[PDB]
Design a protein around this nucleic acid. Sequence first.
RNA 1: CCAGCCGUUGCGGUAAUUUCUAUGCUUUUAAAUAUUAUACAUUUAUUUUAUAAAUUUGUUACUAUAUAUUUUUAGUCAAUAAAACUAAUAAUUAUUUUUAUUUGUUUUUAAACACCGUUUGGUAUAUGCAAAUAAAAAAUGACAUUAAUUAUUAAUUAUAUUAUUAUAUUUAUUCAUUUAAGUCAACAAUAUCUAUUUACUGUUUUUGACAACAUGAUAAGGAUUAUAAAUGGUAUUGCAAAUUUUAUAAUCAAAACUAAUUUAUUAUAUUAAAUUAGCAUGUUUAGAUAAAACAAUAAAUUUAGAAGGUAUUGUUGCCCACCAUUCUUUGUAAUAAAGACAACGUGCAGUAAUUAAUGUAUUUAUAAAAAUAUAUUUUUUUUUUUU
Lengths: 202, 44, 235, 272, 48, 142, 141
Amino acid sequence: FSRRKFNREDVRVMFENYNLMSKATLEADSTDSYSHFYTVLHDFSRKVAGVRIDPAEVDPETGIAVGHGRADGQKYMFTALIRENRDHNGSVTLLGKPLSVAFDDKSWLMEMVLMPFDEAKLDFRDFDVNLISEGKAMPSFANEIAAFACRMAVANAITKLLPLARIPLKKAGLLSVDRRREPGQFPGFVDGKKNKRKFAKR
Amino acid sequence: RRGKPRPRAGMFPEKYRRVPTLLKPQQGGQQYFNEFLIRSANDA
Amino acid sequence: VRPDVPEDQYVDSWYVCTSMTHHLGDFRPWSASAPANAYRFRPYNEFDSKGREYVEHLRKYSRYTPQASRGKGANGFPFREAFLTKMNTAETAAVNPTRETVMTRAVAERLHHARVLSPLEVQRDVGRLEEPLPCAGKIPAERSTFPFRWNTEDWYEYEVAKARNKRFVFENTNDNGVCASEVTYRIVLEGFWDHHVMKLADDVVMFLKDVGRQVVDEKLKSVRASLESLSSGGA
Amino acid sequence: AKRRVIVPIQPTPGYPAHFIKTSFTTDPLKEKQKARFSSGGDAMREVQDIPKRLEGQRSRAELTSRGDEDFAALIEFIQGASYDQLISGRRFRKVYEKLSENDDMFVWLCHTAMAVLNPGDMRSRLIHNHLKALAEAVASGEMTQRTAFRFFESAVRSPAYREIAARQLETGTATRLAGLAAAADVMREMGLTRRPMSSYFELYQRIVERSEAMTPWGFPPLFQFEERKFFSRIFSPHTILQGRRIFWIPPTWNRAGRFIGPHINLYPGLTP
Amino acid sequence: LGYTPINPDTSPMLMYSQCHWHYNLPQGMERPSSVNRSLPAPYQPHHS
Amino acid sequence: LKIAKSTFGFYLARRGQRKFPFHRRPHIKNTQAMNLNAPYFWSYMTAKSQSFFLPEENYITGDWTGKFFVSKRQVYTLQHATSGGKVRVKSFPSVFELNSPSRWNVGKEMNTLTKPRMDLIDDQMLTKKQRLDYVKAGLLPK
Amino acid sequence: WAKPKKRPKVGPGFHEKAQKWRDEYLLDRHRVLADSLRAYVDFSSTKRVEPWDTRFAPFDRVEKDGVYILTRYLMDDKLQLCNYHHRPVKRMLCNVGLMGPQVTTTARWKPYRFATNPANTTRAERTFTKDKTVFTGYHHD
RNA sequence: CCAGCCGUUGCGGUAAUUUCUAUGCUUUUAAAUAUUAUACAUUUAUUUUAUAAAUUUGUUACUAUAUAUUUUUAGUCAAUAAAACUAAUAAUUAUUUUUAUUUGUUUUUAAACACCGUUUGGUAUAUGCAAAUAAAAAAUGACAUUAAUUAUUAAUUAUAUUAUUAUAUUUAUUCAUUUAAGUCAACAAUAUCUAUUUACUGUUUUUGACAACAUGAUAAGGAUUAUAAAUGGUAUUGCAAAUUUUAUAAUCAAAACUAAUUUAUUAUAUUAAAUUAGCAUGUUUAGAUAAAACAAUAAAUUUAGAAGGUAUUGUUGCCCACCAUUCUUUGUAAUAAAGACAACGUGCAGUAAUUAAUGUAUUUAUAAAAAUAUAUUUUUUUUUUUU
């Protein structure tokens, strides 16, 4: 203990050993003057020697699972309602249009929305996924920085629908969220983003 | 302005220090591992 | 950096770049922010913030009738999506499962003596293959309801009319409902600090709950008086 | 060069006299120099290394039923994982001393037993008493370790001590399990630690770790004890505050130009 | 800190000092001021 | 200012080459008052409609002892050009008059009439420093 | 502070150089006006080079065929009356509507100061050497 | 920053506890002042005398084939190979060198390297003369009359390849704006028991916030403390709280550039209402030069950890000689010496300091100094225990 070889997870375990012992046990251990240390350090005394799967939270009525996705901090926010289209002719649609029209029939973007289905080995012909533009609404979503926000929004959606699909997704990062943020406005920089003004020496 | 030279790359912080460690590199195609372990178990 | 408690306790300090608790040095753990044994400390176990945001509407549209809108403002509007896709009976023509699908299943279900199962009902489980399919594994998929592929110009007309009709709430009604009333006073307190206005908006409640209960009670004492067998007053 | 003049400000019902004599200076040159700390009532004891001395009847009973100081420190720290507080190194640091009060003494015994070859028969009441007397001096700090050592080695042991050893001891070296028996026996006699096994342990545990380094036992006499240890236990300047920091002093606006707060998660992370 | 005096009704450093409330404390009402109803003054106007 | 060209030099600071919002540049410097674009000669620096009434400064409100000069927003009429009397407009250094009248001036406000930035500069008004800077410029060579 | 240092007096008797200079300049203002106004007007009465760019369709088509037919027959006298300035013709040509919307989208037109060249502007050196005495805003010729 | 002061560091820079004043005030009471006298070490001390010592001596080494770029950073230039052996080192600490002997200048190039110097000419190393650091002394300067000192070393001074991690990296550049003064105090009218109070009159002595000096005080600026929510600083930037003792300078409509500290719109379509920009077409072309690592996408030509300062908030630090007045002073050597001292001009000699410094010797010269020859470290370090 003095040599400090434990981590933060152990302190929680030592601590819950202390709360859990009754004051009667203290006076029952303060006799030895060593025994209560064995308990307050129970797990750590032995540790010197030696992917989450949540419950699926679907709507039992409509069979709809909801997930959320965010990229560029907040400038893009989409949520992906997903249900099982039993007739195998399901579709992915976005903002009242098939994924083609919103993404302007671009491959490198419409393919990103596809990964969460294939990554989990599932077939999207069964699944009916609509995406809702919660963030700052823009005319055309034809940029990957928005696609990933959708690629994540669909990823989180499948997990809520299907519990053990979180394993192949999390190992491939589609669930994990970027913390990248485009620099907010600032007057000092001439363009306002990252390029300062000019200064000439005399 | 700087008026001093440009610093090196290493002294600058990591260029993508925000993207999660899971994404660099993206371990894509986890679907196939179950297909490949089978055919490999087939030949073996 | 600051104790791991529900964030709403902290008040963004002024002139002192740190955080301070609106509770005077006391800290309520996450337990108080939820009911007994709540998954992930939610008021309800079933969904997250967004999952409880959009399941609201999908349940609110299931009861939408042309009356629910009249008199009520933006609240009266149905789910923007569930209602606009309905407005689109152009694509609504329910494309039956393709000739290939009904084939690939018929070959499966009969010829190869193999049942076909939908992905929800697929036992993705490696251990717990006795966990049932979700209780709605047989929900009917149609073109009108889901997804929400809607009409463009109408989608304007909805989103605009929503923005203008925010004020057109007629709350003074003759109903018997949680929002039926003859007069609706709204008091808008205004303090520089969130925790100020909250603790205040908590106070006036337990104030108006007192005077409101008593004052209305006297009229209720009057009303039952104005009716009974030898209690005339409505003579 | 037109040196400025600043009138000294008298004490005031707002200005305590001990404040202005400290918070103010008339000399304009001494302005704007630096932050000058000064301890107070309680945390002063730790930097001064003095407990509350026996002032009166209150202070006495404050120091009677103190109890097991070794455990209370381990409770103050371990509770850093409850909701109310976060783990603080300053509280952990408090433990290290509560455990290693008596290490200054414990280090000295691993020396006198396991580094003094041929101490003589430590079974002797004569020799053993020399230790208990000196063990009374390393602990309580009456004598520094180096002086304590040179007492034990040159303690008055025996007449013709060199010759009697020449019969039992050929190459000068001698056995330790006779010494370590008496060595561990001192802190049994002297009520050093509440835990009985701490004495025998930290003796036995310091030795075995020392039994591995090259030239295990002999120490260079310059470093034999604490002295002026062997048995032991780009943006960074201008971006010094922005990371996760604990503000032992919170920085006000006039101090930090554009810093808003350490708690503030500037660039967020989606947390379900 | 100058000739222009500090407006005591709008300054935090004053209003949120120790000699007044802080913005953290329960912020209730300090003391009810019954002036007009304990010792009331009569209406002697200057305008006839 | 570095060189207080009037009483308002001691107070206001240049604040660098500050970029004011459009049409909110503080000093009304109509150095582009007379920039003759012959096609737009009736629309440039004039009333945007040709059915407005004349500005106030072309008229006399009450019993005036007398104006030293009539303002520069006044518009020139034939009565102006034909009566020929001394008509003065404020400008540096002291005042400018329209001694030689013409009808090419009728209809345009006095802003478009005077030349604000007189080409002939004063080697007398500018110290050895500020003149030197004109020498390098070639506007006041040597 | 660079403490604001005074500028010296305006100089003795410069006022007389002012009332003089401003006046006889305002007299020069007349002739440059009178010259440029004529230049503008007499420009408007002359013919211009054709505003279209022959390189792009539908003006690559040979003079015999194509939109040159309607240019030669249905509106020929008109396009001479409008003096082939690039403002009216693109408005006249849009009125005939027998070529559809291909005025703006398909048909590309000469740049501005390339379309103010008068007829018989053979040498390309011309379009930049228009006189400097006239103040017109490059409508002149 | 002048007068003045002075035992003495040092003071005087328009807020002097240091001059001058006046006044008071202080004293331990034969006054101040100026001139003299008034006690080395010896146990260890670096610049100029030693002479208790074994020396002097030593004949070996290396040259022919054509055919034709080596050496240097760099042009000059130009046959190219080479010089190894052994002395001894044997008898007392002594007895008084003091005019004697002694300390790296060395014939012969018909011999080379080396070196200075160019078309090469030299010169190329103990046969004379030549004491000289290596206790013997008393505050630096200085010829032994000058100046009041001088000298000095351990604080401090960011990049020299050590065993979770990247600079090589585009996107830019012609930019300006300000006017024509005015503070010396307060006064219900409707619907509450009536006031003409309606039209409440009493004659005049000061000079900071200013156009001027007048203490404080928050900014710009990146360079070595996050892996499970942060990339902008204190030394300070015009108007701010104790120094006053010429003076109204403030936005109002219609108004004139000289200013370092600035995205201006570059060829399908182009002025609608408070007044708003006509000459600069010339190969997105000089030299200078500007700004990113943040929700995006460039992850390496490569890093803690040893080092110096004559400066002393420290390299924009000091210093140094020649080059003038001076003054002073002599032992009068081009063009006296020494000391003083602040100009201008010329460098930039020194602080490992732009080829390390110091010393000595020879030579060279605008001047600090430079080249060659030896010691040397008050220069920084690079480190095989028989292959």
